[PDB]
Ligand SMILES: *[C@@H]1O[C@H](CO)[C@@H](O[C@@H]2O[C@H](CO)[C@@H](O)[C@H](O)[C@H]2NC(C)=O)[C@H](O)[C@H]1NC(C)=O
Ligand SMILES: *[C@@H]1O[C@H](CO)[C@@H](O[C@@H]2O[C@H](CO)[C@@H](O)[C@H](O)[C@H]2NC(C)=O)[C@H](O)[C@H]1NC(C)=O
């Protein structure tokens with residue numbers, strides 16, 4: 001029983017991190033595509049075109 | 051309202067000529083929110099679950115109390131009254147270890163859930179600070195389409211935002227050219243693009259049809275009529291000519 | 297609450313093997329009709345029994361796997377249906393060398409978004425939950441160390457952060473303003489969001505409609521001792 | 536733009552760069568699932584993918600298959616190349632490419648008269664960059680470390 | 685570092701049974717006389733003993749629940765500094781006279797500087813299992 | 827950040843003093859007093875507790 005529970009706990013933590021990345025990617029889909037962005041070096045290096 | 055429009059490309063003169071047709075549309079749009087909220091039973095689901103979890107796990111913990119954990123009985127008084135010390139400690143240790151281990155699971159799950167809610171609240175704080183106390187050009191960050199204004203409202207353990215947005219509706223075809231040619235020189239438009247209905251040529255804004263007559267007061271000069279591709283010859287008007295003929 | 301039909305999915309098995317299960321055979325699940333097949337389907341996730349396949353595509357409601365969804369609609373007087381997902385409506389764009397398109401008239405819309413901001417606070421008592429007013433249980437418990445010393449801190453962390461969240465979200469302005477006594481604004485109409493003086497409480501119609509659409513848990517704590525002794529002898533979960 | 540648009544000749548409508556991206560990354564096994572009758576015979580290629588299925592640990596296929604992912608992601612490239620950014624708000628509006636690029640330069644404080652004066656110079660540069668990127672994804676496999684972990 | 689007086693809070697009680705809320709009639713006389721309720725106050729979160737209720741308003745220091753707070757003051761009496769509890773106040777009440785044909789414009793400006801602080805990393809640590817679990821006993825090693 | 831962790835490192839030392847219901851906290855006394863056949867009934871509690 002113990003050797004099961006520990007495993008589950010680890011999974012939960014990892015889940016959070018992955019979401020913390022995916023929720024970032026969505027924003028980069030809707031601010032550096034579908035439009036131009038003036039935030040400095042948010043996408044690429046130097047000024048941004050496409 | 052005019053200054054709000056000015057930030058997304060629409061010229062200041064549009065609003066002052068269409069005031070009533072905007073006021074009525076805004077009132078009609080506000081009038082639908084009650085029905086929109088009342089239509090779907092899952093309008094507030096994102097809040098409801100937040101309660102249910104914390105109103106459920108606790109219950110399970112109480113139901114946890116019935117396990118005997120490999121002892122001979124569940125209630126604690128029976129072990130004390132029915133048996134003798136030299137092994138009663140051996141009997142008790144199982145129950146104490148089981149319950150002390152059970153409580154930690156609840157503690158850890160509460161930590162993780164609070165850790166998630168902290169991030170959600172931080173995102174809500176950014177939305178409140180950026181999209182009701184100014185204006186944002188980040189596309190799709192606040193609402194769908196372009197952004198004008200927002201209004202907040204409170205609710206049990208949460209907030210609801212109302213966003214106001216501006217959307218073009220009806221569109222028309224046109225034939226265009228990149229630059230214009232005259233007397234060996236080439237003219238470019240300061241803002242907007244050249245639009246021709248098949249008979250003449252005009253300039254216009256990028257988001258609302260409003261023709262004007264081409265002059266030297268809204269274009270400028272660069273290069274020469276040789277390099278650009280697709281250029282078309284035409285005429286150019288000068289405002290000082292009909293005034294200097296006197 | 298609506299119907300009584302069911303469908304079964306066997307996970308990741310070639311359901312030619314499924315007929316092995318037999319009602320009279322030594323086995324706990326021994327259902328008859330779903331073991332055999334009158335209309336069966338095969339998916340990369342397993343085998344589906346009880347469903348009827350249809351080629352017409354709809355925006356699907358409940359998921360199964362491998363891009364297959366099930367739904368309940370009046371086909372022919374009605375039975376459950378499974379189908380492949382529909383990506384969405386399609387269009388086309390008339391690209392050209394020297395053609396443009398521009399708008400001529402505008403419309404205004406309003407949209408709604410919802411966000412949670414905090415969670416309910418809680419507290420536990422270490423000794424009562426583990427001994428239940430036993431006498432020497434406390435003596436036997438005092439030896440094991442300091443779990444009861446640190447659980448309280450672990451919970452107090454959340455109990456103190458849950459108020460910092462709300463204090464930070466709603467306090468971006470210091471002063472307190474108020475609307476002018478006259479509600480004229482050149483044509484618009486804000487009577488649905490401003491607070492209503494006639495209500496005995498300082499609230500607004502949208503907030504009032506919101507408050508009654510969520511079932512908050514029991515609370516009030518005005519008086520608690522001896523409540524479940526009298527007319528609440530039918531014990532409620534809270535006490 | 537022939538190096539990032541789908542090729543109808545390919546069996547499953549995958550862009551050439553996507554083939555290199557899939558083949559560089561290695562999965563746990565050639566197939567996502569090992570069905571009940573697949574592992575009856577102890578072929579040497581049978582790894583831990585199905586040996587642990589006897590202990591109640593299972594994996595499940597995801598909801599959206601890769602083909603639907605490709606169909607979604609081709610739509611964005613189709614939209615951006617032919618309509619600019621305006622299709623992220625309402626009805627789509629067509630507009631020729633060069634004026635879109637002119638708008639892009641005007642966005643960052645360079646008067647558009649530059650673009651129309653050097654158009655043929657820009658293309659010969661741009662096409663050189665894309666053709667390089669493939670080599671940059673074949674020199675070393677250290678670029679895609681994260682997707683392995 | 686300042687004084688010695690304290691205040692006691694009982695949670696979720698009609699403390700009209702304060703001798704019964706805690707069976708102090710079997711405890712020390714000091715808690716017995718602190719249970720007499722010299723001057724009690726009632727809040728939605730319970731009741732408070734050892735402080736006086738005031739009709740003023742201030743921003744508060746020590747949170748207590750249900751929008752009440754408590755602090756330590758000296759100006760209430762002639763000198764005899766004591767603990768008080770009061771309802772928290774949000775801030776100054778101000779209004780702007782709206783009018784449909786008049787605006788305001790600034791004439792003079794100023795420059796300010798402000799500070800922000802952020803943690804970037806925590807310290808690094810490591811633990812050994814075998815040495816800590818028993819500490820040099822071969823029987824544990826087995 | 828400097829404070830909390832330090833405290834979280836001190837308490838782990840103090841838990842080394844609790845007896846966990848065994849005969850004695852010191853690990854050498856059990857092997858210097860009891861016999862090999864029966865010390866295993868006691869060592870298990872300490873091992874699990876730590
Ligand atoms: C844009 O189109 C709208 C239609 O959405 C038109 O609004 C008309 O407004 C008048 C006065 O309120 C109504 O009597 C008409 O019935 C509306 N038209 C329709 C089709 O219902 C109008 O052509 C344009 N309005 C603006 C503000 O640009
Ligand atoms: C104006 O342009 C639009 C968009 O380019 C045209 O809309 C479609 O154009 C395609 C061209 O292949 C036709 O097949 C469709 O029938 C058109 N309509 C729709 C609803 O898709 C439009 O035809 C052009 N002209 C007008 C008067 O709108």
Ligand SMILES: *[C@@H]1O[C@H](CO)[C@@H](O[C@@H]2O[C@H](CO)[C@@H](O)[C@H](O)[C@H]2NC(C)=O)[C@H](O)[C@H]1NC(C)=O
Nearest residue numbers: 077078080081082479480484485486487488501
């Ligand atoms: C502002 O709008 C609200 C709602 O659209 C108006 O209030 C409604 O007025 C109608 C009369 O036409 C009544 O039948 C409803 O019962 C009212 N509802 C509510 C919630 O008040 C209000 O009259 C409008 N204000 C102005 C100045 O026109």
Ligand SMILES: *[C@@H]1O[C@H](CO)[C@@H](O[C@@H]2O[C@H](CO)[C@@H](O)[C@H](O)[C@H]2NC(C)=O)[C@H](O)[C@H]1NC(C)=O
Nearest residue numbers: 787788789790791792793794795796797798799
């Ligand atoms: C704007 O306000 C500043 C205050 O910081 C004024 O600056 C002071 O002006 C007085 C009046 O001559 C001087 O004696 C001070 O030395 C100035 N500096 C400071 C730091 O006080 C400034 O004059 C104001 N603007 C105008 C146009 O008068």
Ligand SMILES: *[C@@H]1O[C@H](CO)[C@@H](O)[C@H](O)[C@H]1NC(C)=O
Nearest residue numbers: 246247248249250251252261
């Ligand atoms: C183009 O607009 C001019 C404006 O005066 C008008 O005279 C002409 O008839 C229009 N031609 C077409 C084809 O719309």
Ligand SMILES: *[C@@H]1O[C@H](CO)[C@@H](O)[C@H](O)[C@H]1NC(C)=O
Nearest residue numbers: 231232233234281282283284
């Ligand atoms: C446009 O007019 C100019 C006269 O300045 C002429 O040189 C040029 O060839 C003309 N172009 C076309 C396409 O007729």
Ligand SMILES: *[C@@H]1O[C@H](CO)[C@@H](O)[C@H](O)[C@H]1NC(C)=O
Nearest residue numbers: 089090091092297298299300
């Ligand atoms: C259950 O179904 C009946 C009729 O089909 C309906 O009136 C009722 O509202 C349904 N239950 C709920 C909770 O909606």
Ligand SMILES: *[C@@H]1O[C@H](CO)[C@@H](O)[C@H](O)[C@H]1NC(C)=O
Nearest residue numbers: 310311312313570571572573
């Ligand atoms: C499943 O069984 C059918 C026969 O019923 C057979 O034709 C097919 O190849 C089998 N597939 C797998 C993956 O076992």
Ligand SMILES: *[C@@H]1O[C@H](CO)[C@@H](O)[C@H](O)[C@H]1NC(C)=O
Nearest residue numbers: 348349350351352353379380
């Ligand atoms: C659905 O399409 C398949 C493939 O064309 C066909 O065999 C089947 O008969 C269709 N379903 C119906 C109900 O016609």
Ligand SMILES: *[C@@H]1O[C@H](CO)[C@@H](O)[C@H](O)[C@H]1NC(C)=O
Nearest residue numbers: 279280390391392393394395
């Ligand atoms: C667009 O112009 C190019 C050359 O500039 C030509 O090859 C192509 O056929 C033209 N297409 C249309 C639709 O005019």
Ligand SMILES: *[C@@H]1O[C@H](CO)[C@@H](O)[C@H](O)[C@H]1NC(C)=O
Nearest residue numbers: 518519520697698699700726
């Ligand atoms: C307990 O306090 C509440 C506070 O409002 C009061 O209404 C109630 O009457 C009190 N109970 C008793 C038994 O006095």
Ligand SMILES: *[C@@H]1O[C@H](CO)[C@@H](O)[C@H](O)[C@H]1NC(C)=O
Nearest residue numbers: 736737738739740741770771
């Ligand atoms: C304090 O306020 C309460 C509530 O209005 C009032 O009953 C009481 O008389 C006030 N005390 C003084 C000294 O004014």
Ligand SMILES: *[C@@H]1O[C@H](CO)[C@@H](O)[C@H](O)[C@H]1NC(C)=O
Nearest residue numbers: 779780781782783786787788
């Ligand atoms: C300017 O007008 C506001 C009302 O709009 C008023 O409160 C203020 O006192 C006026 N300024 C001065 C210097 O009186």
Ligand SMILES: *[C@@H]1O[C@H](CO)[C@@H](O)[C@H](O)[C@H]1NC(C)=O
Nearest residue numbers: 478480481482483783784785
């Ligand atoms: C400004 O408000 C006054 C007060 O109601 C009103 O009489 C006047 O008509 C308003 N101005 C305009 C332009 O409507």
